[PDB]
Amino acid sequence: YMTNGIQAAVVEWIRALDLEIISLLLSRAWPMALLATSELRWRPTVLTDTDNVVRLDRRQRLVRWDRRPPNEIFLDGFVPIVTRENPDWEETDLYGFAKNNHPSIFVSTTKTQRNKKKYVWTPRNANRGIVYQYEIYAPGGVDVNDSFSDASPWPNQMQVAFPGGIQNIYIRSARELHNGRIQRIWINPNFLDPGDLEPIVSSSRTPQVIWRMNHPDGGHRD
Numbered sequence: 001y002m003t004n005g006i007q008a009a010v011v012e013w014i015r016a017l018d019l020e021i022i023s024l025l026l027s028r029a030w031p032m033a034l035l036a037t038s039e040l041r042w043r044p045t046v047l048t049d050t051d052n053v054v055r056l057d058r059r060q061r062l063v064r065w066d067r068r069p070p071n072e073i074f075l076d077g078f079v080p081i082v083t084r085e086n087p088d089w090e091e092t093d094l095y096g097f098a099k100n101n102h103p104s105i106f107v108s109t110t111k112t113q114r115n116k117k118k119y120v121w122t123p124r125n126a127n128r129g130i131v132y133q134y135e136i137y138a139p140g141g142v143d144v145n146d147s148f149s150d151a152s153p154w155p156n157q158m159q160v161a162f163p164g165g166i167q168n169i170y171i172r173s174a175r176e177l178h179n180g181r182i183q184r185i186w187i188n189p190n191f192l193d194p195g196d197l198e199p200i201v202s203s204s205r206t207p208q209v210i211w212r213m214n215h216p217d218g219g220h221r222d
């Protein structure tokens, strides 16, 4: 099948490499028992979504929970923790990323479960402090559950991994939560719109704000 692969990556050395080389780095540490049953499943250009409707990869609504504010995220995109050119095998492994998540080349996201009224996997401390729920509409990425199947360590997370990061042009919006209570919905003006996307999930009470570089209210964190 055809896949955009690492089109969303912000790290330059991952962006330059061939998909077979990046695929090797993700799968090289997999045990023989895992290799027998599992395959490295990149999200295809046309995929079956969580509500069993066939959509393009860029129309699958992904989400990333993060405590960093819009002034970081809409400026730089999502940069992974490990960006160096010669990482360890633990830092490039998809299975260890899925199982443990120690500092790695991947940026984790979760799929919108559209069969359950746009539910997403929520971390336990989402309602503590200042937290942002970033809305992502990106190409490529590695589907974790499709890859490992029954051997997927935490399938409730519904992970789509992005080795080398996610560019800021694929992030549409961000819901600013203060102790699990919505304050604002940030709008990314540099979002490359693929068309046919549903409206941003918002009440009449919640004020929507268009972001710019060094926004006055756009750098709130713990």
Ligand SMILES: NC(=O)c1ccc[n+]([C@@H]2O[C@H](COP(=O)([O-])OP(=O)(O)OC[C@H]3O[C@@H](n4cnc5c(N)ncnc54)[C@H](O)[C@@H]3O)[C@@H](O)[C@H]2O)c1
Pocket: 063, 064, 065, 066, 067, 068, 079, 080, 081, 097, 098, 100, 101, 102, 103, 104, 107, 108, 109, 110, 121, 123, 157, 158, 159
């Ligand atoms: N982020 C999500 O919404 C999401 C989605 C699905 C699964 N998970 C799982 O939940 C757990 C938590 O993941 P996570 O996303 O918080 O882990 P992470 O490695 O992305 O980051 C851990 C901490 O580092 C910060 N951080 C990340 N990249 C940074 C950078 N470049 N510079 C500075 N700080 C940076 C994050 O804000 C966070 O506080 C993992 O097991 C992950 O697999 C998370």
